[PDB]
Each structure stands twice: as C-alpha cells, then as structure tokens.
Amino acid sequence: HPQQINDIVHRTITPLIEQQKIPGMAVAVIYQGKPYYFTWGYADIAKKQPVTQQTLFELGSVSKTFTGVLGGDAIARGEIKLSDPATKYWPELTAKQWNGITLLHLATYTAGGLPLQVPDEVKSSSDLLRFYQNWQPAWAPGTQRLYANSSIGLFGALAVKPSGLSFEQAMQTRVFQPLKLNHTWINVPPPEEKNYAWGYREGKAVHVSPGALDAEAYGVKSTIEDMARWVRSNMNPRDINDKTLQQGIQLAQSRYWQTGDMYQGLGWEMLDWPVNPDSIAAHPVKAITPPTPAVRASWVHKTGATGGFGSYVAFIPEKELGIVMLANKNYPNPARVAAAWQILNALQ
Numbered sequence: 490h491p492q493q494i495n496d497i498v499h500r501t502i503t504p505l506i507e508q509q510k511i512p513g514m515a516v517a518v519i520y521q522g523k524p525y526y527f528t529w530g531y532a533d534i535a536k537k538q539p540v541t542q543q544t545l546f547e548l549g550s551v552s553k554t555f556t557g558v559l560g561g562d563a564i565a566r567g568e569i570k571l572s573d574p575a576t577k578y579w580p581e582l583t584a585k586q587w588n589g590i591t592l593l594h595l596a597t598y599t600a601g602g603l604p605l606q607v608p609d610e611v612k613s614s615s616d617l618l619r620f621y622q623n624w625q626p627a628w629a630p631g632t633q634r635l636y637a638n639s640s641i642g643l644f645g646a647l648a649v650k651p652s653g654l655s656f657e658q659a660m661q662t663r664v665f666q667p668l669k670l671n672h673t674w675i676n677v678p679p680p681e682e683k684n685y686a687w688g689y690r691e692g693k694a695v696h697v698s699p700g701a702l703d704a705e706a707y708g709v710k711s712t713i714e715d716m717a718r719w720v721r722s723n724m725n726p727r728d729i730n731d732k733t734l735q736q737g738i739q740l741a742q743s744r745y746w747q748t749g750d751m752y753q754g755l756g757w758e759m760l761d762w763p764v765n766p767d768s769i770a771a772h773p774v775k776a777i778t779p780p781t782p783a784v785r786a787s788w789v790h791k792t793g794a795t796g797g798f799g800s801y802v803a804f805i806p807e808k809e810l811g812i813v814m815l816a817n818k819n820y821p822n823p824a825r826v827a828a829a830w831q832i833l834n835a836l837q
C-alpha cells in the first residue's frame with residue numbers, strides 16, 4: 490500500500506468503527522486504477538471469525554446499481570427502450586393508471602409514488618400483479634422522485650423479459666460473469682455459505698429475509714474484492730471488451746433527471762465534482778433532454794442497507810478514485826458518506 494492510503498484510511502475508518510460500534514468491516518480504496526484492501530473485526534462475532542477479503546456482505550440497495558446496469562445492457566441490445574410503456578412488457582397490467590408510465594419512470598423512481606416497500610404478503614406472481622393493479626399514483630408520471638424498492642424492483646423484472654432469462658440468470662450471465670465477479674450472489678450457494686458474514690441489529694445475528702422483487706431491489710451479496718472490481722468496471726467501462734455491457738454501464742451514468750444537486754442515473758446517483766461534502770420524502774424532478782452523457786467529473790455513488798448491514802460505494806471517474814465500504818452493522822448514512830468523502834478528498 491501507498492503510505493498515504495494507509496494513513497488516511499486508518500485515520501478515518503478506525504474512529505468510525507469505534508463510535509458506530511461496527512463489529513466487522515471491509516474497505517477497498519481504488520487509487521490510480523488499483524485496489525487496496527483493508528479489513529477489521531469479525532464476520533461472525535460468536536465464532537470469532539475475522540472479516541477477510543472473501544467475506545460476503547449484504548449490499549442492500551447497492552444492488553440497485555447492478556439492476557441499473559443490467560437494464561442499460563438490455564437497452565444497448567435493443568431489447569427495451571426506457572421510453573417504452575411498462576405495459577409493453579406486462580400486458581396483464583391493464584389498470585388505467587398505468588397508461589403513461591414507462592420503464593424510465595420505474596427505473597428512476599418517477600412513476601408517481603410507488604411505495605418504498607412492496608407489501609410483505611406479496612409473494613407470488615399473481616400477488617405481485619394484484620398489488621400493481623390496485624396501486625394508485627399520488628402524482629402524474631415523470632414529475633416527482635420517490636426513492637422506492639417497488640419501482641426499480643419492477644423495472645428489473647420487466648427489463649429482463651425479452652432476454653427469455655430469469656432476472657438472476659440475466660444478471661449472472663450478462664453482468665457478473667463478464668466482469669469476473671465470481672463471488673457475487675443474488676442467492677449464496679451452500680458451498681459458499683461459510684464466508685457469508687452475519688449482520689448485526691441490536692446485537693442480534695440477522696440475514697435479510699426473502700421478499701418480493703428482492704433480487705432486483707436489494708438482494709445482492711458480495712466481497713470487498715468483487716465490489717472493488719465493480720467500481721473499477723463502472724469507472725472505466727471503455728476498458729471492457731463486451732460491447733453491450735460497456736454501453737449499458739455508460740447508460741446507467743446518464744443523467745435522466747435533476748433533483749436539487751443530484752442527478753438520477755439507472756441505480757447510480759451522481760453529483761458534479763467537486764462536491765460540497767454537506768450536499769451529499771418525494772421531490773420534484775426536471776427531465777434532462779437529452780439525458781447528459783456520463784460526466785467523468787462526477788461523484789457517482791450509492792448507499793445501501795439491510796437490517797444487519799450498511800454499505801456504501803462512491804467513485805470519481807475523472808480521477809480514477811473510488812471507495813467501497815462494507816459493514817455488518819446498519820449505521821447512519823451521513824457517517825458513511827463523511828468517511829468516504831474524507832478519504833477520497835485526501836487522495837485527489
């Protein structure tokens with residue numbers, strides 16, 4: 490490691506762990522293109538199993554970045570357009586409030602107030618259809634952003650329909666495998682279970698429960714090494730020898746809407762670099778026309794949580810600088826962002 494990386498990471502992450510009382514943590518700092526790894530504490534407190542570079546953490550909503558990119562890849566293939574009505578890919582969704590709602594709206598939380606959570610009793614395909622059929626928008630499409638699992642969750646499920654594959658099969662074959670993310674899972678295979686960290690909520694060991702559209706909205710588990718590779722792939726997509734995937738990664742950093750200081754991509758969210766560290770409910774959106782092609786001078790990021798895990802990813806493509814922070818405790822987002830900003834700001 491470059492000493493300055495060690496110095497700033499030790500300075501920054503050590504206190505964070507102490508005050509947030511985080512039981513285990515992994516961090517990757519991407520600096521001049523290369524990854525540097527750090528680990529702390531335990532994946533399993535009871536068994537005193539240390540966090541390693543092979544420890545799997547629940548990504549929570551960081552999963553949305555994978556879904557956004559997979560959608561981008563489908564657009565690149567000509568399988569979908571974001572301007573297409575959602576009903577084009579689910580004709581059984583006949584209720585009139587769906588007229589005018591597009592894949593873009595689903596992907597970017599702008600469909601008009603889809604709920605943050607899919608109702609907990611929704612399990613089957615018929616349950617899911619009935620849920621969407623009964624949903625009533627609070628706003629017209631394309632006018633308000635309400636960050637929500639039921640929105641991008643449906644986007645992911647519909648985006649993969651033309652492929653003929655399940656969402657998991659599409660993600661595995663079109664995103665995970667081409668990028669050599671060989672320890673990244675929607676469903677952790679039994680032989681890999683020993684590396685799956687427990688999450689901790691009020692001292693209790695927990696893993697995320699099954700829920701409708703979980704794969705699409707929050708269900709990915711990954712290692713610090715794979716997540717470093719993910720960040721690297723999104724920072725320099727032109728380094729990928731897979732045309733539609735490269736194009737998809739670029740489309741996910743297109744700026745489709747603006748809300749205050751931030752811009753909504755597909756899964757990824759973006760702000761202009763340099764950012765004010767203090768700048769990082771529903772809010773009105775303005776369409777950006779044409780959507781701004783991925784801006785390399787951006788803070789590109791996404792936070793994620795499950796009951797037992799807190800995750801954060803941020804990168805600045807212009808500077809070849811990025812960070813992944815994975816912890817097996819859900820701790821406040823401002824703390825994650827503050828630590829990430831301190832580390833990247835020191836290395837620019």
Ligand SMILES: *P(=O)(O)OC[C@H]1O[C@@H](n2cnc3c(N)ncnc32)[C@H](O)[C@@H]1O
Nearest residue numbers: 549550606607609638707793794795796
């Ligand atoms: P992102 O990390 O913002 O959000 C995804 C996390 O939210 C929780 N989640 C989604 N859906 C539910 C339901 N129905 N009930 C309780 N919690 C839910 C999970 O923690 C996701 O990881």
